[PDB]
Design an enzyme around this catalytic site. Sequence first.
Site, PDB file in Angstrom:
ATOM      1  N   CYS A 118       0.790  -1.234   0.000  1.00 28.18           N
ATOM      2  CA  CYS A 118       0.000   0.000   0.000  1.00 28.18           C
ATOM      3  C   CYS A 118       0.827   1.292   0.000  1.00 28.18           C
ATOM      4  CB  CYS A 118      -0.971   0.014   1.191  1.00 28.18           C
ATOM      5  SG  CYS A 118      -2.104   1.455   1.120  1.00 28.18           S
ATOM      6  N   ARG A 121      -0.394   4.632   2.626  1.00 31.39           N
ATOM      7  CA  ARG A 121      -0.314   4.536   4.072  1.00 31.39           C
ATOM      8  C   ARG A 121      -0.087   5.817   4.875  1.00 31.39           C
ATOM      9  NH1 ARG A 121       3.740  -0.299   4.763  1.00 31.39           N
ATOM     10  NH2 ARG A 121       4.234   0.119   2.549  1.00 31.39           N
ATOM     11  N   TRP A 290      -9.412   5.647  -1.602  1.00 29.48           N
ATOM     12  CA  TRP A 290      -9.676   6.309  -2.871  1.00 29.48           C
ATOM     13  C   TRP A 290      -8.602   5.872  -3.854  1.00 29.48           C
ATOM     14  CZ3 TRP A 290      -9.211   9.502   1.618  1.00 29.48           C
ATOM     15  CH2 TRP A 290      -7.935  10.045   1.843  1.00 29.48           C
ATOM     16  N   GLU A 295      -4.153   3.284 -11.254  1.00 37.18           N
ATOM     17  CA  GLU A 295      -4.875   2.028 -11.063  1.00 37.18           C
ATOM     18  C   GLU A 295      -5.915   1.852 -12.165  1.00 37.18           C
ATOM     19  OE1 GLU A 295      -5.388   2.944  -6.528  1.00 37.18           O
ATOM     20  OE2 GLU A 295      -5.803   0.800  -6.690  1.00 37.18           O
TER      21      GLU A 295
HETATM   22  C1  HEM Z   1      -6.477   6.483   1.297  1.00 39.60           C
HETATM   23  C2  HEM Z   1      -6.260   6.077   0.018  1.00 39.60           C
HETATM   24  C3  HEM Z   1      -5.528   4.956  -0.421  1.00 39.60           C
HETATM   25  C4  HEM Z   1      -4.810   4.913  -1.565  1.00 39.60           C
HETATM   26  C5  HEM Z   1      -4.613   6.075  -2.553  1.00 39.60           C
HETATM   27  C6  HEM Z   1      -4.198   3.598  -1.646  1.00 39.60           C
HETATM   28  C7  HEM Z   1      -3.461   3.135  -2.747  1.00 39.60           C
HETATM   29  C8  HEM Z   1      -3.086   1.801  -2.969  1.00 39.60           C
HETATM   30  C9  HEM Z   1      -2.593   1.296  -4.230  1.00 39.60           C
HETATM   31  C10 HEM Z   1      -2.381   2.102  -5.519  1.00 39.60           C
HETATM   32  C11 HEM Z   1      -2.496  -0.056  -4.085  1.00 39.60           C
HETATM   33  C12 HEM Z   1      -2.192  -1.125  -5.143  1.00 39.60           C
HETATM   34  C13 HEM Z   1      -3.512  -1.430  -5.840  1.00 39.60           C
HETATM   35  C14 HEM Z   1      -3.388  -2.478  -6.928  1.00 39.60           C
HETATM   36  O1  HEM Z   1      -2.396  -2.424  -7.685  1.00 39.60           O
HETATM   37  O2  HEM Z   1      -4.288  -3.346  -7.029  1.00 39.60           O
HETATM   38  C15 HEM Z   1      -2.921  -0.380  -2.746  1.00 39.60           C
HETATM   39  C16 HEM Z   1      -2.944  -1.672  -2.215  1.00 39.60           C
HETATM   40  C17 HEM Z   1      -3.337  -1.982  -0.892  1.00 39.60           C
HETATM   41  N1  HEM Z   1      -3.887  -1.063  -0.002  1.00 39.60           N
HETATM   42 FE1  HEM Z   1      -3.942   0.922  -0.146  1.00 39.60          FE
HETATM   43  N2  HEM Z   1      -4.535   2.811  -0.559  1.00 39.60           N
HETATM   44  C18 HEM Z   1      -5.403   3.636   0.173  1.00 39.60           C
HETATM   45  C19 HEM Z   1      -6.192   3.177   1.221  1.00 39.60           C
HETATM   46  C20 HEM Z   1      -6.153   1.907   1.770  1.00 39.60           C
HETATM   47  C21 HEM Z   1      -6.950   1.498   2.925  1.00 39.60           C
HETATM   48  C22 HEM Z   1      -8.034   2.300   3.648  1.00 39.60           C
HETATM   49  C23 HEM Z   1      -6.589   0.231   3.229  1.00 39.60           C
HETATM   50  C24 HEM Z   1      -7.005  -0.586   4.320  1.00 39.60           C
HETATM   51  C25 HEM Z   1      -7.480  -0.238   5.555  1.00 39.60           C
HETATM   52  C26 HEM Z   1      -5.598  -0.137   2.216  1.00 39.60           C
HETATM   53  C27 HEM Z   1      -5.046  -1.394   2.119  1.00 39.60           C
HETATM   54  C28 HEM Z   1      -4.284  -1.854   1.070  1.00 39.60           C
HETATM   55  C29 HEM Z   1      -3.892  -3.224   0.926  1.00 39.60           C
HETATM   56  C30 HEM Z   1      -3.965  -4.340   1.990  1.00 39.60           C
HETATM   57  C31 HEM Z   1      -3.305  -3.307  -0.299  1.00 39.60           C
HETATM   58  C32 HEM Z   1      -2.857  -4.591  -1.024  1.00 39.60           C
HETATM   59  C33 HEM Z   1      -4.024  -5.199  -1.812  1.00 39.60           C
HETATM   60  C34 HEM Z   1      -3.610  -6.335  -2.737  1.00 39.60           C
HETATM   61  O3  HEM Z   1      -2.683  -7.094  -2.373  1.00 39.60           O
HETATM   62  O4  HEM Z   1      -4.228  -6.474  -3.829  1.00 39.60           O
HETATM   63  N3  HEM Z   1      -5.307   0.895   1.331  1.00 39.60           N
HETATM   64  N4  HEM Z   1      -3.278   0.771  -2.046  1.00 39.60           N
END
Ligand code: HEM
EC number: 1.14.13.39
Lengths: 414, 416
Positions: A118, A121, A290, A295
């Site tokens: 992520c 974070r 968001w 993506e």
């Molecule tokens: C606030 C805005 C957020 C943005 C801009 C963001 C952005 C990202 C991006 C770009 C990825 C990779 C997505 C992909 O390639 O499929 C990602 C993965 C991830 N994010 Fe974040 N994130 C945010 C919020 C969150 C929140 C609220 C959580 C959980 C409480 C979270 C948990 C994760 C997890 C666990 C992954 C890995 C998912 C996977 O393995 O497919 N993210 N995030």
Amino acid sequence: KFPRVKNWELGSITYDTLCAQSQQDGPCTPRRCLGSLVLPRKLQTRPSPGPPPAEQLLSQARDFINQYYSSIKRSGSQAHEERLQEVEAEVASTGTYHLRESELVFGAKQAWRNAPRCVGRIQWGKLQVFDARDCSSAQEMFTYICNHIKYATNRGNLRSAITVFPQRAPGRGDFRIWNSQLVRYAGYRQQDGSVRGDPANVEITELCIQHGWTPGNGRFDVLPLLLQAPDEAPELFVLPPELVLEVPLEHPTLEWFAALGLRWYALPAVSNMLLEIGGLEFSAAPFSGWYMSTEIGTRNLCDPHRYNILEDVAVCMDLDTRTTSSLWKDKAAVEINLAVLHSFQLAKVTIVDHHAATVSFMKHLDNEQKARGGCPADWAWIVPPISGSLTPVFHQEMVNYILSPAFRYQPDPW
Amino acid sequence: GPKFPRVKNWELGSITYDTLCAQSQQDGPCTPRRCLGSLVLPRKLQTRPSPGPPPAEQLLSQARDFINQYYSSIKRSGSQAHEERLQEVEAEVASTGTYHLRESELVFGAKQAWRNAPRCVGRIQWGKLQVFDARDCSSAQEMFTYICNHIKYATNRGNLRSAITVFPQRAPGRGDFRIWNSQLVRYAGYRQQDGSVRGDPANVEITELCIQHGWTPGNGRFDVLPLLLQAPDEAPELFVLPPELVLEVPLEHPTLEWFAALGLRWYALPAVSNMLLEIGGLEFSAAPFSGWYMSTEIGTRNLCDPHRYNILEDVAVCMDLDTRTTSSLWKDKAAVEINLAVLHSFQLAKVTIVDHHAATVSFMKHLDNEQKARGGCPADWAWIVPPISGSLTPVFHQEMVNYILSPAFRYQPDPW
Ligand code: HEM
Ligand code: HEM
Ligand SMILES: Nc1nc(N)c2c(n1)NC[C@@H](c1ccccc1)N2
Ligand SMILES: Nc1nc(N)c2c(n1)NC[C@@H](c1ccccc1)N2
Ligand SMILES: [Zn+2]
């Protein structure tokens, strides 16, 4: 022992000491690295027909409880010791235990904080946690999910959230959301094997029809939800149109772009991952935030196995698709990402471009180095699908490891 | 099923198992606890100077392994000449503490080192390598002649040919042969009064060394540096490359007429000269190798890295983009045109070059060939995926397994 981490753009050096806390194992070994692998061989999360070993669960729980009381600086207090007792007492007697609401909130936030893949974070401390552990039917799950979507969407001013359904219990089936995301576009496989819509969703689209869904024939048909209560067949639930905010795509200067009819939903909510806190497992805990523009613009729309619209747009831009050297792919991609940002910003829907996102992540890395002495990060996932070296994270060495609480992958219920 | 790493390509859904990694004898930086796969220089391979002669046994097993690899390649394993060569090798090591490679063995080992390089995306060409045997070289002066001959052959007036020149191996109780410069062609980097840098920031230290060694510095953005060649136990000697030998390409854009006015350019020949070539335990401290450029190396990394020429902002301003906001994607737009300019300019000048799309597609073919030929291919995903348009290329969607195989090209400490 402790890795020397270097940023080659700035020449700065840090020593990651947080990885020492990792009790879980990754796929790598000294003989070879599998860091680019998307999924584990079995790191997943096997069945839960039997109770997890008391010794192990007890240590994962104690560790987590310690983490919690350390977070509220009451480490060592009577409340801290009495909680440990309550947990031990419950585990010894029932082979499991339950979390206090405040602990669940801390755990949910920490799980996000620890997610190596992520890039968003920096927002980890701002997460609305919906406790849905008192859910006893697919129908109830549906109501909770609709509440989540309504709150998170917020008419375009997206807010990060997570809804936690009942933990897995030894002996009985899991609560599960079959869809990988709360919002998915159907993928209709045709006669010749090709697909209409989103190819990533062919299987789930088929399962839905199989369970009574009346399909359509468009490229952007929002799928219904298949929610599963323990040891019961999943139920179909059509999401109310007014709850699913979608953003129609158009380009700031290219008038013909809008004619493509492309669009994408505003809410990114993963619903197939498992949330592990202190040894307890939440098989259904969808979370959302968001989108980062790449993506949608780079992966969802340009992946060859996704919507694959690169040539379409290139042809409309009258680019030379004859040879690779004309960089028609790179040019088309840029405009597609631009159109995404433009459309979301015009629609007043929260979105973040990859430059801003990685800039914030660098700051997050800094905060974490001071706060915990490190930060687990998966370089391959953090660096964006386009303009890699144009962003700061590309030039930053990273250390990847597993910390708990954690979001983990799990087997598909079918 | 199989007990080896399962590797998936998510674009095609195809699966393979890497069995070749079972052949690795040298450990990497990762552990079950944490992945250090993204570090540029993890302290493992690192061929740190090991003066005092190596353990006869250690060298022997490395030597026998290589000899076995060699006879396997010519399909004479277990044969007569095979067992005789083995006896001959441990015979040499017995009395002298080291051994020497036959001509054909050096050629095989050099091509194999390239083949084994996890960070190289142009390995589909691994079979076509001109191996210049320079093991007779005995002076820094001779090194220069060999190097000049290398550049001449490799450049071939724009129609580049992959080549490597191998100088004498490390010998016990005797200094190394070393080329101080990281590459045979490097632009000077001058540390300005105001602290900034004129030229290439990457070469600031080597530039200051050339100066400390008698070189009279210039003051341009693209001044070609002299070579600091070092023979055993002798101080480094400075040599200036004849300008006619250093082919360069003035950069211009196919449509943006103003781009040529920027006065940008890059040399045609990419020749790494500070890496150590290890074959069967023998260490070739000086063994420059060269091929041809993949356009993103020049257009994206060399010209756009914040710590390199950093021209992104200048080019964006010329394109009249909104450099005040990230969402304008000005960095992305400028990068694209700079990369296009590089491709266009090399093509126009009839100089060999390959774009990141073609290169990666060919690397995928290399992967298929190697899956069949060796049951796998060590590859460093972070280095194989291009610095721009990553997921637009096929390699992004290809899982990869990284491990160390020998013969190999290894990093080594700077001579100073
Ligand atoms: C606030 C805005 C957020 C943005 C801009 C963001 C952005 C990202 C991006 C770009 C990825 C990779 C997505 C992909 O390639 O499929 C990602 C993965 C991830 N994010 Fe974040 N994130 C945010 C919020 C969150 C929140 C609220 C959580 C959980 C409480 C979270 C948990 C994760 C997890 C666990 C992954 C890995 C998912 C996977 O393995 O497919 N993210 N995030
Ligand atoms: C025929 C043309 C070739 C192409 C297009 C090619 C392309 C590349 C590229 C893109 C890199 C990464 C550059 C960087 O980011 O610094 C690289 C690295 C490498 N290449 Fe190749 N290569 C070719 C020929 C060669 C040859 C002839 C050899 C050796 C005989 C070789 C050995 C290596 C090694 C060892 C590395 C890693 C360098 C490092 O770790 O810094 N390549 N190559
Ligand atoms: N943000 C992000 N999402 C992915 N699905 C992804 C990456 N990064 N980076 C690596 C890539 C991948 C795909 C297939 C094979 C190996 C690596 N997958
Ligand atoms: N071809 C290529 N060249 C590099 N110099 C490079 C990569 N890939 N990929 C990773 C990147 C890097 C730099 C600094 C830190 C971490 C990763 N360095
Ligand atoms: Zn690793």
